[PDB]
Symmetry: D2
Subunit: 243 residues, 4 copies
């Protein structure tokens, strides 16, 4: 997370950390609890190949990464079938936990947006995670969970921005409809934040607008952060996660 | 180049090295001389942003990188307009040299294939470059140009290979018509070889079949190297490069 | 610490961590509380030059590095005058704290040995720290304080071991009287442990026998860990630290 | 080499490069040809343990490292017996080649100094090598042999300099009689230059005064480069190398 501050302990009860077995259970991506037994994340977090499930764990909300771990094994990994190597469309996946977690004030699910919510410019949104605090600048120990308020940029304007200083034809769409843009050159998500949540407060309720996916650099001029647009994948999510 | 040998001085007179101004004019990609004044390379080599031409130079055929350099300036870069960030299609670009090179037996152009050549399995083809000799293993000093014979894999067979061990739907195409596959778990191109040529000996004549583009790993089982298919872009190339 | 286990919370109340101002107060050496206002460490830890004390902090016994830090500034540093660069004798120093720490069962001083104690082979001794767990292998997050029992090796036996496979003449002493040897190819201290304590249980009382100093590799065959012998410098220590 | 310039091809016909087998024959230190069959270098270059000779090679003078290598195997390694791990005295070693080398104007021996030559301040001296051009800044390809003129600092003055900003007792000698000091904050040898020659022109003749050994940093204020004083070891050298 670039340009943000440490999250208060009572915020983002749905934030999770994905861990891979490598000398220790190392964080590699974020995710969000969307049901007592399901985690939402990015397809590229669990790629490029089908993973041996024994090598992965999920950690529910922690103010400081690694310090009070209670790691949870995963029962199944479901990656959107339209997703493939070196491309950013359909960057979404689900992790079914072996067990349903206890829901509480400190740990609980985030609501998915209704299909009609477009999350227009001006909407108040925050992206959270334990990722880099700047390009190639990792979050220092004790690894506090960070948050940053990011401005939403309308898709067409965002697509135009991505064409500035690029070789791509004006009529070639970089930012697609299953994507959402947020951030500026001072506030953004970054490497290490992938798969985590972009949430917006709509009429007093927190809704998950996006999943951290990609961007050119982090907080780079004319390059807003790109998120998988959750509303676009609600039917797919609903095939697996119960109401 | 993975699994090859150092190239004889008399081979591959069209091979070029692209250089970026660092603490030295460091090699970052390959290319091929297809006209006395034009170099063919990969779009991602001169990406992601429009380049300041002052930071780039071209080095024509030399046996060892950096030793007997004679760097040439670039007057123009043309990247296929369909090309954009974090996607692999249309990975092709042209570099116009400031001056046409003096053609000799040691340095000359490579012939482009006729639109009808498909380069089917069994065709003898070589890929050349100064790239990594293994995953994360750079070419050691004195940086000899290397070559390796790589087996062609038919596109659909190759597409199926890339679905092995992947979450991608069988109906979702990974390998496209503007791509060509070559290489196996013993012989392949790698990071540092991008933009360079894959040439095949077709009934007595060398024809450039592809441009090193991407792959999962280098010489990784079931993941052949992927090249931009030259015949697919002949019309685009001929729009800029004279007869 | 190579070959040990995480230490119980009730153990080693005298252990301290020395911190340097980087992007965070990063751990670089260990030390021991030998008086409520004095920390004992290795001279090379506070070298090569006279330090700007604004760049250093002391952290008393904590179970995990960086988590519940309560950093203390250093009033002054006193390095043994016989110590100099690229030489390993007289590797010992004292850090005076601004004020005395509150002594409790979880944080208290370690007893220094009486001048006559030689700590011969067979003595049960432990070395503790947050250093590397193998050669070039840092302690993984959450950075638990580790401990390992290390076997003592008599000095001359140790001196002979260091001549094995070395060009040094047999009459040239490598291990000196102000040094103590401990550890084997399974258990040892390592980089990051320097300045920390080697304590032995003597007739029911823990006494600090040495200060982690140097060695060839960590847990390397025929290369036991080398420690500054505390009894050798009691007079120098008592010149600053009250009884 | 810090400061200075690339050497004319006609200078330093005695410079050699020591290579270790590591993916390629990698340069790790310099040396000097002091007899058609003997190379003089630093003991620490061939430490810390007795080396398997199959892993070492010597390369005679070449303008650019790695490019026109003609590697030579070593028959014997003789390290001064007073030298030992982590200490800087007696930093001198000899390598006997399997065969005598051909002597020419471009490749020949450097003369050793008479025992009476003290190389006092004011003497014109140059240090040469392929090492770092600044702290942690390696020589870039094509790796030209570099040279720099360095001023001699009298031993006592030098010893006093090394006490400036250090904790060492004024009466504790850092710079010893078997050492020689040369260089300043603008001109110096560095990592990668060890074992190479410091030569001074005396009454029109080049004599090897020192062997690159150590220093605090490279070209660091109040820290001249420290060399093994060749005259101090003439008897030892003469026990093995024919006059
Ligand atoms: C799920 O929550 C159960 C109930 O926890 C208690 O009530 C909650 C509302 C909350 O206030 C919590 O802090 C309370 O502890 C847990 O069971 C309880 O576990 C504690 C020990 O951690 C034990 O002292 C209680 O007797 C026990 N009560 C019950 C209803 O059994 C679950 O813990 C698991 O089940 C326990 C029986 C035990 O096997 C423990 O090791 C298990 O983790 C909570 N489950 C999880 C996944 O944490
Ligand atoms: C040692 O030098 C011999 C003579 O070198 C030649 O004369 C010099 C004055 C100079 O002009 C130099 O450039 C010349 O090459 C070498 O022998 C010569 O080697 C060359 C091939 O390298 C050959 O064509 C010559 O006929 C031959 N002449 C003689 C007098 O033998 C030595 O080379 C080695 O020995 C050779 C016989 C051959 O086996 C070659 O492969 C060897 O390298 C030089 N020795 C070394 C170790 O370099
Ligand atoms: C928010 O609430 C107001 C008042 O109830 C309503 O008019 C508006 O449409 C609501 N917006 C959304 C996105 O539900
Ligand atoms: C250099 O030459 C001069 C004049 O011949 C002589 O006096 C001086 O001592 C010589 N120095 C050496 C080292 O020979």
């Amino acid at each position: 997370i670039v340009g943000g501050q440490e999250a208060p302990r009572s915020k983002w009860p749905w934030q999770v950390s994905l861990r891979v077995r490598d000398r220790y259970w190392m964080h590699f991506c974020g995710g969000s609890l969307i049901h007592p037994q399901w985690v939402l994340t990015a397809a590229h977090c669990v790629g490029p190949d089908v993973k041996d499930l024994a090598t992965l764990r999920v950690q529910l909300r922690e103010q400081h990464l690694y310090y009070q771990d209670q790691l949870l094994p995963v029962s199944r990994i479901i990656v959107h079938p339209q997703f493939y190597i070196i491309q950013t469309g359909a960057d979404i996946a689900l992790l079914e936990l072996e067990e349903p977690v206890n829901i509480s004030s400190r740990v609980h699910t985030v609501m998915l947006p209704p299909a009609s919510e477009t999350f227009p410019p001006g909407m108040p949104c925050w992206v959270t995670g334990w990722g880099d605090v700047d390009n190639d600048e990792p979050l220092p120990p004790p690894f506090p969970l960070k948050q940053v308020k990011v401005p939403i940029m309308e898709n067409h304007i965002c697509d135009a921005k991505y064409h500035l200083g690029a070789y791509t034809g004006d009529d070639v769409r970089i930012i697609r409809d299953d994507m959402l843009c947020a951030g500026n050159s001072q506030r953004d998500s970054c490497q290490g934040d992938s798969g985590g949540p972009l949430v917006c407060k709509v009429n007093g309720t927190w809704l998950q607008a996006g999943v951290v996916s990609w961007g050119e650099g982090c907080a780079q001029p004319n390059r807003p952060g790109i998120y998988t647009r959750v509303t676009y994948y609600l039917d797919w999510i609903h095939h697996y996660v119960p109401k």
